[PDB]
Write a protein that binds this ligand. Structure first.
Ligand SMILES: *C(=O)/C(=C/c1ccc(N2CCOCC2)s1)NC(=O)c1cccs1
Ligand SMILES: *C(=O)/C(=C/c1ccc(N2CCOCC2)s1)NC(=O)c1cccs1
Lengths: 304, 304
């Protein structure tokens, strides 16, 4: 019993974190095999950040200008390249703690754990989701750049995010491990406003299923709805449209609880229309959307 | 920016988790130096659990009846003893991954990270608090017993909790690493009801300070209060009494924000009396109490 915002165990990723310094800028790097991945803005001064030409700035840098430190020992940089918004620093030593890994590009609504780091050292781990506007609501201070987001499937770490910046609004933007930003964000200190942060409907429904499995059932009503009727209500409340693919994904939770997906949609529609009335669901006074149907199944089943 | 329910990096604790089996019961153990710590109820059958005499049940067990497996390799048990509600299994091999560690007994209101494990393997990490009724609101399934709670200070892991049971109400109880239960709970399947789960006032105030530091200031009012007036309101809302020790502990957050502790108490008093009115603070519709003043300082400063 109980349902918590749970992150993956971070050990495998802690063994990959290094400090990268270029000139006066220090941030974090991810060391996998003989390559250290880090945000390309490590080459920028605070002034360069206003309008950087990364190709031009990188010409003034050599291998010896990138200082890579792994747990108080210096790594030798024998090559460097820019791939989109990340730098790949080839080092002469393969990371002995390299886990099995993949680089994945996630879709909005997908969750992942972040290992927040400073100066190559881990400070904490938390769970978040790729928002529908392609921002993440993290907890990052200056120097956290290069901290990564990941999911674990048994022994394989799928790296999906690398932190690059905080928007003027306090929300966060970054890239996949190929250096491509999620959303329309650029690594420049310029006017970048995020779009509507809509609620991830399929995740709210998954969390309502977790609530039923954990005994919190007060919100279950005597109604049902259709996908089209539910979506008229969802659009009005800034919830993402629910598709038949989402209904299919909720199948296992629907089967476990015996609650048809469309019945849970009708319960959620009434919660949107009536509010919580001062009540809570799984200790929350708002509808939680940073648990995917997969996270709910995983947590409720005890996947290790 | 941003404020997240952040757990400590779990790597150091992942390297200590083992599987302990006695007969048909399998749970988790913590391997530190040449000792494996686990709940003594590993010797119980589901029937024994109704009214166990642990001393008597332990007489029927020898070293070879405790099977300890660390990452698919078997450890040799060369001694066993019962200390309060934990068993200490002496093994012939010191854990090579033993971090610097301490065993601490925490007070209610204190937070810690839990590394939920099944069959000696980590499944997830989350942050929780020792409630004022000495329960924890975790996320534990059968087989999670022996999972531990901990805090990290740089390189020293202070182990403070070991999971032993779920109360009939779905909340959790366990011991410190000396085997002493937090609260009045016993490791027996009997009627054990928890006391009032009051709100940890000093932690709510700390989180309101985190909110101000992160730009969420709508709740700041033009009033102040006294400790005695605030506490009359706190008692009415099932909040723990605020003491001068708590005021002193909030000193650093009061200094950083320039908001006197008693002014923040008056803001909190108005939130209790008026409610949130459909508004949120740090993305929450309720007042969060599982962040200590130390956690707020740590997260807002980037301690690694
Ligand atoms: C790296 O750690 C880092 C990079 C940034 C690049 C641009 C930034 N912003 C700040 C807001 O105004 C526009 C430019 S930040 N910093 C950070 O990720 C953070 C700094 C403070 C909090 S998080
Ligand atoms: C160990 O993993 C474990 C021990 C328990 C001992 C007594 C328990 N209860 C269950 C509720 O009724 C009274 C007796 S549980 N189990 C657990 O921690 C859990 C089992 C289900 C969820 S957590």
């Amino acid at each position: 019993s109980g349902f918590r915002k749970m992150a993956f165990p971070s050990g495998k990723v802690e063994g990959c974190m290094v400090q990268v310094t270029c000139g006066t800028t220090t941030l974090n790097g991810l060391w996998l095999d003989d390559v250290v991945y880090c945000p390309r803005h490590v080459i920028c001064t605070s002034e360069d950040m206003l309008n950087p030409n990364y190709e031009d700035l990188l010409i003034r840098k050599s291998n010896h200008n990138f200082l890579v430190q792994a747990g108080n020992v210096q790594l030798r940089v024998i090559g460097h390249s820019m791939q989109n918004c990340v730098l790949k620093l080839k080092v002469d030593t393969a990371n002995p703690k390299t886990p099995k890994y993949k680089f994945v590009r996630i879709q909005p609504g997908q969750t992942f754990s972040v290992l927040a780091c400073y100066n190559g050292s881990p400070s904490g781990v938390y769970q978040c989701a790729m928002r529908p506007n392609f921002t993440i609501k993290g907890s990052f201070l200056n120097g956290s750049c290069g901290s990564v987001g990941f999911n674990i499937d048994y022994d394989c770490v799928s790296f999906c995010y690398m932190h690059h910046m905080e928007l003027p609004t306090g929300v966060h933007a970054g890239t996949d491990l190929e250096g491509n930003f999620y959303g329309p964000f650029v690594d420049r200190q310029t006017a970048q406003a995020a779009g509507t942060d809509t609620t991830i409907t399929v995740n709210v429904l998954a969390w309502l299923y977790a609530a039923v499995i954990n005994g919190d059932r007060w919100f279950l009503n005597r109604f049902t709805t259709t996908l089209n009727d539910f979506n008229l209500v969802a659009m009005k409340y800034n919830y993402e449209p629910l598709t038949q693919d989402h209904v299919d994904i909720l199948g296992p939770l629907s089967a476990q609880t015996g609650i048809a997906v469309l019945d849970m949609c009708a319960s959620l529609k009434e919660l949107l229309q009536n509010g919580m009335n001062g009540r809570t669901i799984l200790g929350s006074a708002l509808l939680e959307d940073e648990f995917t149907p997969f996270d709910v199944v995983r947590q409720c089943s005890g996947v290790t």
